[model samples]
Target chain A: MDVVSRLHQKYGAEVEKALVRYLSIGLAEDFREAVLYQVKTGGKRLRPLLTLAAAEAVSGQWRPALPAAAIVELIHNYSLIYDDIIDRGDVRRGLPTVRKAFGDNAAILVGIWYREAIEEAVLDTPKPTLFAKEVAEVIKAIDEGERLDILFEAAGRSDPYFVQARWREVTLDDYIKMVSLKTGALIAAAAKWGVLSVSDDRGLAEAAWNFGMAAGVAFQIIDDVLDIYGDPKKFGKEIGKDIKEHKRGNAVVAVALSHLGEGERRRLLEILAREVVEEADVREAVALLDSVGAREEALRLAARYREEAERHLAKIPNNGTLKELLDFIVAREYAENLYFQS
Target chain B: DVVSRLHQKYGAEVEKALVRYLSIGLAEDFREAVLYQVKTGGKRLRPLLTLAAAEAVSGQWRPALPAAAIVELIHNYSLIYDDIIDRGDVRRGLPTVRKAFGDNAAILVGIWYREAIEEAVLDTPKPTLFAKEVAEVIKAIDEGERLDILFEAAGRSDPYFVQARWREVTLDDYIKMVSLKTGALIAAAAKWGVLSVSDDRGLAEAAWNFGMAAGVAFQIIDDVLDIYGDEIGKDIKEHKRGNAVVAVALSHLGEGERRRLLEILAREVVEEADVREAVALLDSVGAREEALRLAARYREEAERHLAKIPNNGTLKELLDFIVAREYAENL
Candidate 1:
C-alpha cells in the first residue's frame, strides 16, 4: 500500500469529477473538448491530495475541502499549460503538450479559460473571499517565480532592470528564491488553503504554508534531480530537460555552475545555447555537473528541506497520513538508485 | 472637449488608485514593466467609465475606485496577450509590452497582472459578485478574441475559420465579435462600478447595456480613426477586414469596385497603393460616412439605455466623449 497511490485512490476520483463537472459550467460547449485536452493528461494530483489531507488533518473533515481541492487543481493544471507554452515543450505526461497538439495561440486561450474556470470554481467554496485572495496571491507568487525562472535563462539577461549577469553567476540563494515562489508558493497554498477551507486557524494555515513550502522546495529539487538521473518512463518526461531548454534555473545546474572551472562554464553555456540540444549535449552537461558533486548537493538540499517540512508537520495534527505523504514526496522509489547510497 | 476633459477630471484620481494597487508590493525587476502596461498610453476610457458608472448610478464614485483600478488592469493585461498573439509591435508609438520585455516576460507580466486584478478585488464593494462578473467578462472576451483571431487568420484552412463554411458572411459575425472583444470589458467596467456603488441589479444592468452600446461605438470610432488618422489605413496594411469601414464598405460598393477591394484585401503582400486604393474605394461608397453613422447608431442606443438612469451627473458627458470626440487633430 503505497501512501501516495492510496491517497489518490481515495480523493483523486471525487476531485476529478468536481473539476470536470465545474469546468463544464464555464467552457463554451463547442470548445469544451479542446480545453479538456490538457487536464485529461494526469500528474500526481499531489496538490489536491495535500489539500484534502490538510482538511482531514485539521478538521477531520475532507469533504469541505473539495471545492478548494478542485480550485487548486485547476490552477495547477492551468499553470502547467502555460509552463509548457513558455518552454515550448513537446510532451507532457507522455502525450503531446497543449501547444504541441493545438497551436500556441489556442494554448494561450486555453490557459485564460483555465483561469476563468478557477474564478468560477471560487464561487462554490465555503469561504469564497478568503479562497479568492489565497488563489490571487498564490498565482502571483507562481507568476513572479516563473518570471524569475525566465530571467535566469540566457535571453532574459537582455533586460537592464534585472538579470544583467551571466548564467554561471546565478547562485544557490537565487535558485532558492525562484523555486520558493514558482513551485514553492503553489504547493504551500495547497496545504494552507486546505487548512483554510475547513478551519479558521491562522496559526495552522501559516504552519501548513511553511510545511508545504519546505516540501515544495524539496519537490522542485527532486524534480530537478529527476530531470538528470530519473527514467523518462517514470519521470513522464525526457532527461536533462532544463539543459535542453537552455535553462540555468535548475537547482542542480545552478550548483554545478557555481563549482565549475572557468573553461568548463563556457563549455556548459555553449551546449545549452545550441538552437536545439542534441542528446550528446545533455550527456556532456550532466558529466560536467556530475564531476562537481552538484547532483549530491542538490539531493542534500532536498533532504534538508524535507527535514524542515517534517518539523513543520510536527506542529500539524495528523494520523500518520500527512507524514506518509511527506515521506513519499522526498523519496520517489521510481528513480533508479534513489539516493546514491548516501 | 467632453470625453478628454471628463477623462482628465477623473483620470488623475483613478491613476493614483490603479498605481497604488499595482505598487502595493512588487519586485524592482517587474516595477517598470508592470507600470508601463497601464501607464503607456490610452485615454483611460475603461476606468473613467467605471467611475462615471458609479456616479451615474448613485452620485458617488469613490466606492468604485477599486473596481476602476481592476478594470484597467484587466484591460491592459488583455492587451499584453493580444499583442503577443497578433505579433503587433507598437502601442501608441511605443514598443508593445512584448517588444520592450521579451514575450516571455510579457507573458509572465500578463499572468501576474491578471492575478493582480483578482487579488485587488478585495477592495471592491461586493468582491465575490464583482469577481463572478469579471470571470464572465473574461470568458466572453476569449470567445471574441478567438473569433477575432480566426477572422484575422490568413489562411482559409484555419481551425477557427468556421465562417468560411457559412458561404455568405455578413457584418453580423464581425459585429458580434467586436461586441465581445471590444464591448464586453468596457460594459463590465461600467457594470462593475454600478455594482460597487449600489445593490440595485436593475441599475447595474442598465449601466451594462449602456456600456455595451457605448463600447461598440467606441471601437468603431477607433476603427474609423485607423484609416483616417495619420497612420492612414494601418488596418489595410494588416489585412484586417474586421475594420468597421471595411466591413461596412463591402456591402455598399458596386460590383466592380467590390471586386477590386476584395482583391486588395485578399493579398498577403500589401503595398501602400493598396491601402490608399482600399481607402478610396471606402470613400466611393461613402462607407466612412456609413461607418460613422453606425457608430452614431450605437451611441444613440447607448443614450436610450442611459435614459433609464438618473445620470444628471457627468455620465452623458462621458458617453458623448466616447463616441463624439473628433480625434482628427490628434492625427
Candidate 2:
C-alpha cells in the first residue's frame, strides 16, 4: 500500500527490463560494465512510474510507455552523474558516486552516453518529434538551473572560480523558477510524454504536465526539508548535502535568507562560504534557519504546491488511480516529519 | 564562378539559420559563448556538403537549410568535446570552446548545442527520419570516441587507471575507428541532406558513400599533415590513436624502424624535434608516400561514388573542391 510497494507491483520490473535493454549497447567490456553498474544500482524510479501511470490513465495501456519510462530514468541518472561531479559528491544512494567510482572523465562519458541513449530510445516511440522536443527542452532548462545555482553560490563570493559569476537578484520567485526548471521540467516531461505516448489529447496532456510540475516543486521542497531534518539511514543519501555544499535556491535556504535579520543572514552566508563544513557548523546553520521558521515555511510552501497539483488533476475526470498516486508522491515527501517526527 | 557563388549562398543561409536557431531564449552569457564557438572561423565544409547534396538531388537546397545548420552545430559540438578530451587549446587558429569558456562551461555548452540540434530537427518536416539519423550518428560518434580513447591508451603500463589500460590496435582497426569517428557524421550529413529533399534511397546511399569516402580522405590528409609537420602534433602528443602514419609505419617499416617510431610516439610528451625524427623515419620506409597514395585512393573513391548519383554538376564540383588539394589550401 506504500509508495515503494505499489510502484514495484505496477511498474518496477517493467522499467528495469526496459532500462537493461536500452542501456546494454555493445560498448567495450569495461565501458559497458560501468554503464550497467550505474543503471542496476537501485534508486527510486519515480519519473518512470509517473510516466507509465500517466500513460495508463490516458489510454489504458502502459506497455507502450516503457521506452518513455526508461528514457526518463536514464535522464535522471544522467543528471545525478553530472550533479555528483559538479558538487564533488562522494556518496549517492549509499554507494560511491559515479564520479568517484569511474573517475570524472569516465563519469562524464557515461553521462553523455546516457543522454545519447535517451535520444536513441525516443526514436522507437510513436511521437519521436514531441518526445525529442520535450526532452531537449527539459535538458536545456536543467542546465540553466545548474548555471543559476552555480551563479548564486558565486554571487557574493570573490573566490577565484566564482570571479566571473554574474551577480543576479534572488527572491522567492526566482528560487521557484529555478527549481521548476531544475526539478520540475523533467517530471513534467515524464507526465506529458506518457500521455503523449498513447493519446494526443492536447488538453489532457497539458493538465497532466501541470499536475506533474506542481508535484515536482513540492517534491524538491520536501527533499530540501529532508536534507536538513531526515534521518540519514532512511533517506538513503547523505544528510545535509545541500547545506554542506552551501547550495542556494532550495526552499529552506531561500526562505530562511529572506526572513532572517541582516546579521543572522550574514552569519548564514559566512557558514555557507566555508569550504569544509563540519557537523557542528551544519547544526548551527540548521538552528539559525529554524530561528526564522524556515522549515515550517518550506513545508507550508510544499503543501501549497500539493494543493495546486491536486487542483490540476481535478480537471481530468475519471482518472482511476493517478490522482491517488500523485497524492502519495507529494504526501511521501512530507509524511513522516509532519505526521510523527516533528 | 558558379561554384563560388553557390558556396557563398549556402554558407550565408546556413550561418543565418544557425544564429537564429542558437540565439533563441538562451541566457546572455551562455548565448555569447555559444555564438563565439559557432561563429569562430571554420570552412563550414560539413554544412556545405549538406546543402550541395540536397541541391544535387532535388534542385533546391533551401529546404535542407535546417538540416545543414543542425549538421554544423553537431560538428561544432563534437569539436568542443574533442578539444576537451585532447586538451586542445587552439582550433581554427583561435581558442577552442574549452579554452574560451572554462572547461566546465564548455562541457555544458557542448551539451546545450546537441539539445539545440535536437530541438531544431523536431521543427523540420521529416522529424522521424531526421531524429533517427541524428540519434544514431551521435551514438556512433560517442562509441567511436570511446574506442579512440581506448586505442591511444593501449600498451600503457598503468593498470590502475581504467582509461590507461592498453588494448591491441591494428591498422585495420584504425581504419574502422576513423570511419566511425569521422565518417559517421559526414555520411549522415550528406545522407540527411538528400533525405530532406527527396526520399530516394539510391540517392541517399550514394550521398552517404560519397561523404564517407570524402571523410576518410579528410582524416587521412589530416593524419598525413600531422606526420609531415604541416600541422603540429598536438593530437600526436596527446597519444592520439589511429593516424594513417602510425598504421603505415607499423605495417611497412622493418622491426628496428617500427620500434623507433613507436618509441617516439609512446613518449608522455613528444617534442617537436622527436616528431620531425619520426617523420624522417616514416619517409625512409616510404610510409609517408604510402599514406599519400591511400589518401588519393579515398579521394578517387569519393568521386566514383558521386558519379553514381545523376544530375550532380554542383555536387561533383563541390566534391572535387572538398577532396582536391585546394581543400588543404583552405585548411
Candidate 3:
C-alpha cells in the first residue's frame, strides 16, 4: 500500500475520534445531532492526514499533534458549512449539505460552534499563544477571502450594494492571489501548525508552508478542472458548479481569458453572463474552453505546482513519508480522477 | 446617584473606545450597520460592571478600558444575532440591527464584530485569558440559544407539551442555562476586568460571583417587567416566553394555576386579554411575588459577594442602584 493510504489506515480513525470529541464539547443537546451528522457523512480527512504526516516528517510524535489535526478538520468542516450557503450548493461528498439539511440559521450556528471548537482544542495545546495566532490569522484570511468572493460575484452582476465598492478587472495573477487566500491559506496554516506543534523552528515551518501552498493551489486547480470534466459518480457533488455560480478565480476562466481571441472571449463571457446557465450553455462553454486549450493549460499549470511542491520537499531533511504523501497528492493516478484519462 | 454618575462617565468612555476601534479599516456600509446598533442607546451595563470590577480590585478602572470595550462588543454582537433570531423590531426604543439592516447583513456584521473582537483581544496584555473567556462565553450563549429555541418549539404545540417541556427543564436547569446565556459574559466582564488589574484570585472570583448574581437578577426583573407593565402582554405579543419568571411560576404555582399559565403561554401568540388574565392568575398564586423574591435573593447574594471584597464601596453603590427599589416597584 502507498504511504498515503498506509497513513490513513494508521491515523485516520484516531483523527476522527479526536474530531468527534472536540466537536461534542459543550454542544447543546438540540444542536448535537445537527453538528455531528456531517461528521458521520465522512470526508477525505486529507487535512488532518497532512497535519499528522507533517509532524512525523519533522521528527515530532503525531500523537501529540492530534488536537491540532482535529482543529484543522473542524475548521475545514466549518468552511464547508458556510461555503455551501454562500454558493447555494445542495450536495457535498454524496450527501446533502448542512445548509440543505438544516435551515440556514442552524447551519450558521453550527459553523460558529466549530470555530469555537478550534479555541477549545487550542487551549489543550502547550503552545496556546502560537496556536491562537494561527487560528486568528487563518480565520481573518478566510473572512477576507469570502468578502472578496462576494465582491467578485457582485461585480459580475448589477448589484447596487456592491457597485459603490470599486472593483478591478481580475487578472490571472489576481485570480491566483484570491485562490491562495481562499483555499491555500488554511491548508498552509495546517502544515505550518503541524511543525509548530512540535518545534518553533522557523526554517522547517517555512518549508512546510511552501509545500502546503503548492499542494493546496494544485488541489484547487484540479477541483476547477474536475468541475468541467470529471465523472459525476466519482466527483460526488455536481460538476460545472463553479461555472454555474460564475465563481471567480478558477483556472478555466483565467486560461480562457488569456488564450482566447476577443470574439471567442466575448462568446464565453456571454455564456457565463446568463442568469441561469443551462446544461447546453455549460456544454458550449466547455467546448469553447477545449477549442482554446484552456483545460490543457490548466493541467500544465497543475503540473508546475506539483513539481514546485516536490522541490520544496527536497529542502526539508528526512522526508521519505512526506515525499510519498506529496506523490499521493500530485500523482498522475490522482490527476486521472479529475482530468480526462487517455 | 453616584452609580448613575459613574455609569454615565464610564459609559461614554466605552462608547468612544468602541466607535474609534470599529471605525478603523472597516468598510463604510458594514461600519455604519455596526455603529447604528452600538449608538442605539444601549444601557452599557456589561462594560460598566467591568469598569466597576476593575475599580473594586485596583482602585483604578481606566487601565481596563480595552477589556471593558471587549465585553461590550461581545454583548452587542450577541444582540445583533439574537435580534435576527427573534425578528425583533425595536431595541432600546430604536430599530434593531436586523430591523435596520436585513438578516444577511446582520449576520455578516455580527461575524465582523466577532472578528474585530478577536483582534482587539489579541491586542490586550492578557490575550490568552481574553480569548479563552470569549470562546467560553460564545459557546455557552450558542448552547443557551439552541436550548431556548428547542423549548419554544416544543411548547408551541400544546399546553401539555409545554408542561412536559417544563418538566424536562428543571429549575436548576433553567438557572444554569440562564447563567450560561446571560450570566457568563457578565461574569466574564467582571472577571476579565479584575484579572486585567489585580492578581488576587479570591477577589477576581468574588467579582465574577457578584456579576453573575447581578446578571441573573437583571434578567428576572426584565422578565417581570414584561408582565407587570401596563403594556400587559408585550413579551407575549412578541412570542417571548421561557424566562425565569415563567419557569418559577410553573414550578411554584398551584395545579390549576399552572395549567392556566401553560395554556396561556402555549398559544402561538398571546392576546392582550389572555395576558391580562394570565397576569391575574400569576398574582393569585403569588408567582410574581415569588419571582421578585428570587430577584431580591440574588441581589442580596450579589451584595454578600461584594462584602467579601475590600474597599469596593463604589461597586456596592452600583449594585444598589441597579437593583434599586424604584425599578422593582415601577418597571
Candidate 4:
C-alpha cells in the first residue's frame, strides 16, 4: 500500500482503538471525546509516517515502529492541541480546533493526558533511557518555543483596539526558531528515535538529526507560503490568515514592507486595517505579494532548506524506501512551482 | 452512560472487562480533584518506576505492567493529596493543595491511586499462574495495615498490633507496598522487560526478591529521615502523622510512663509542660536508641539479598547498587 493509503488504512482508527483499549476512568468522558475530536480534525500524520518509514528503512518491517509511530503522532497532537489554544486558532483543517470543539479545559487536559500516553509508549520501548531523553527534548523544545512565541507576541502588542495589530516580532531567526520548536521538534524526534528502536548505527541516527533540521526549516517556509498565498481549498487551510489573525507570519510581510513601493505596502496594510478583509482585498494583497516577490522568496528559501535536507539524506544509507520519501519531499517542494501556482 | 473509557484509553480487553478498574475509590469531590491532577500532573514518574521494575523482572514490559505501576502511582497520588489534608500545603513548593485546588481534589486523587493500583495488580501477567495466592494475601494485608495504623495511634507498647506489625512486615508486604507506593511498580516495570530477556523464573524471582528488600529499606529509611533529620522544613512539609521512628520509639515507653510523651501528641489535649516533659522522658527512656536499632535491623534485612543475588552481572550489579543506596546511613 502507498503511504497515505497505508496510514489511513492501518492507523486512522488509533484514537478509537486506544479508547476501546484503555478507556475506564470517569475522566474518559471528556478524554475520549477530546482524543477522537483532535484526531478527526485532520493532520498530515507526517510524524507517524516518518516513524513507520524509519522502521521500514532499517528492519524491512513497519510493525516494530508501530508503537513509536502512534506515540509520535500523539506527541504531535499534544503540541497541536496546546498550540491551538495558545495561538487561539478557532479553526483547524477548516473545522473547529480541539479547544474550539471541546472548550479550553478539555483541550488543556487532552494535551497533558496525551503527553502522558506518549511517555507510556516510551517507557514501553526497549531503550528506556533513550526514550526518556528524546521525549524530554521534545517537551523542552515545545515549551521553550512557546515561551519565546508568547514573549515575541507580547513585545509586538499595540494599543489601538479594533484595527490594532496584536503584531508580534517576526525576525527571520524568530520564524525559523518557532518552526524548529513548534513543528520540527516532534517530527525530528520521532524520526531519530524511530531509528534507535531498531538500529544501532550512530551515523544514520545523526543523519536523522541533520535531515530533521532541514526538514523543519523547509516545513516552516512551506507553511509561510501557504499562510500567505496558497489556495485555501487545496491546502484546506485559511489563506493570508497570519496577517488578519495578527500572528508572526509577518516575516513575509516584514520583507514586503521593507522592499515594496509605498502603494504596494499600503495595500498589504489595508487588509491589516480592515474589520473583515474581503476576498478582493486579499487579491490585491496577493498582487502586492507578487509585485514584491515575497511569496517567491519564501519558496526559494524552502527549496534551499530542501537542498540542505538532501545533503543529510545522502549520509543515511540508501535504503530504497527512505530515499524515495526523501526524494519525494524534494520534488514536492518545487512541484507545481509552489511559488506561482493557483 | 458511564462507558468504560478505561479500555478505550488503555486498549486492553481487561480494562474494558473490569468496570470499577477506572474508579479512583475517592469521595466525589476528592475524586474530581484527583482526576484533574492525574489529568494535569506533569509526569507519571512513580508508575513509570513500577512498570520499569516489572519490565526488568519480566523482561517484557507491556500493558499488564501498566497495572502494577498503578501502586506507586497511588502512593504518590496519596502523598500529594494527603499533604493537602494534613499540611494544608501545595506541591512542588507551590500553593498548598487545599490552597491551590481545595480539599476535594486532594481527597480524590489520593483515593483514586489506591484503587488504580489494586486493579492493576489484578491484570499482571500470569497473575493466576504467579506463585503466591495474591488475592487473599493482599486482602489480609489490607486489613492488617488498617488495624495497624488505627492501633498505632493509641495501642500500648506490648499491644497485639506490634506483633502483627512485625510479623506483617514481610518482604512480600514491603514489595507490595513499595510497588504500590514506590519501588514495587518500578521493580514490576523493570520485570516486564525481564520477561523478554530471561527464561529462568529464578532470575525473575531474584530480581523481585531483591526489589522487595530494597523497597522495604527505602521506605523504612524514608520514614527514619522524615522523623529524625529535619522537622522544620522537609517531607514533613507533607503531613504523614505516623513514623517508623515514632512507632518504634513510642513502643518502648512503659505503661503510664509515656504520659508527657502522649500529652505532646494528643489532639488539643496536653499542655506545653507535658510536651517538654515528654521529650525529656523519651530521651531518658532511650526511645531514640530503640528506633535506631529497628532501622539497623531493617537495613540488615535489606542486605540479606547479597548472599542470594546471582553472580555479578549487570542485573546483580544494579541490584547491589540499589541495595547500597537503600541502606546508606546518610539518610
Per-prediction DockQ, in order? 0.46, 0.40, 0.29, 0.02
* Model 4 error, position A182 (Å): 1.6
Q: Which parts of model 3 have CA positions greater than 4 angstroms off?
A: A27-31, A85-90, A100-102, A154-169, A232-239, A258-273, A330-342, B1-8, B11-41, B89-108, B153-170, B230-232, B238-241, B252-257
> TM-score for each prediction?
0.89, 0.91, 0.88, 0.49
Model 2, span A59-133: residue lDDT tens: 889989988998888888888888786666788877988878777666766776788778878887887777887
Runs of candidate 2 exceeding 4 Å displacement: A25-30, A155-163, A230-240, A278-284, A317-324, A331-336, A339-342, B1-7, B153-166, B231-235, B324-331
Residues B1-331, candidate 1, lDDT per residue (tens digit)? Answer: 6567767678887888777877755777678888888778787878888888888777888888899988888888788998977777899889998888766567777887877788668888788888888888888888788766665525333343433323333578778988999899888988888888788888888889989998899888989988888467777776676788888888888889987887786688778898889899999889888888888889889999888888645778887777754552232
Model 1 has a DockQ score of 0.46
The models' CA-based lDDT, in order, is: 0.81, 0.77, 0.74, 0.51
> A-chain TM-score per prediction?
0.89, 0.90, 0.90, 0.79
Q: B135-203 in candidate 4: lDDT tens per residue? A: 222322333233333233332232222332332233343334433344443344334334334556665
Tens digits of per-residue lDDT for model 4, A1-342: 555555556655653354223212223331355456676667677667676777667666666666677667766776677667555678887898887766543454355455445545655566654665566556656654554444334222221211122333356666677667766677677677668778888888878767866776676667667777655457455667666553444446555666777676666665655656667766777677778787767777777888887788677664555555554544453534654566
Q: List the residue pairs that clash in candidate 2.
A: B154-B166
TM-score computed on alpha carbons, candidate 1: 0.89
- Residue by residue across A1-342, what tens digits does model 1's lDDT show? 987789888887898888887677756665777788887888888889999999999999998999888888899988888888777788888898887777676788888888888988788888899888888888888887887787777542344433442343577899999999999988898898889888988999999999999988998998888777656456356878788767788888889988999899889878877877889989999999998989989988887998899889999987389888887776645323566565
Query: Which model is ahead, 3 or 4, in terms of DockQ?
Result: 3
Q: lDDT by residue for model 3 over A158-188, one digit each (tens)? A: 3333334424455668667767777888778
Query: By DockQ thresholds, what CAPRI class is model 2?
Result: acceptable
Cα lDDT, model 3, residue A136? 66
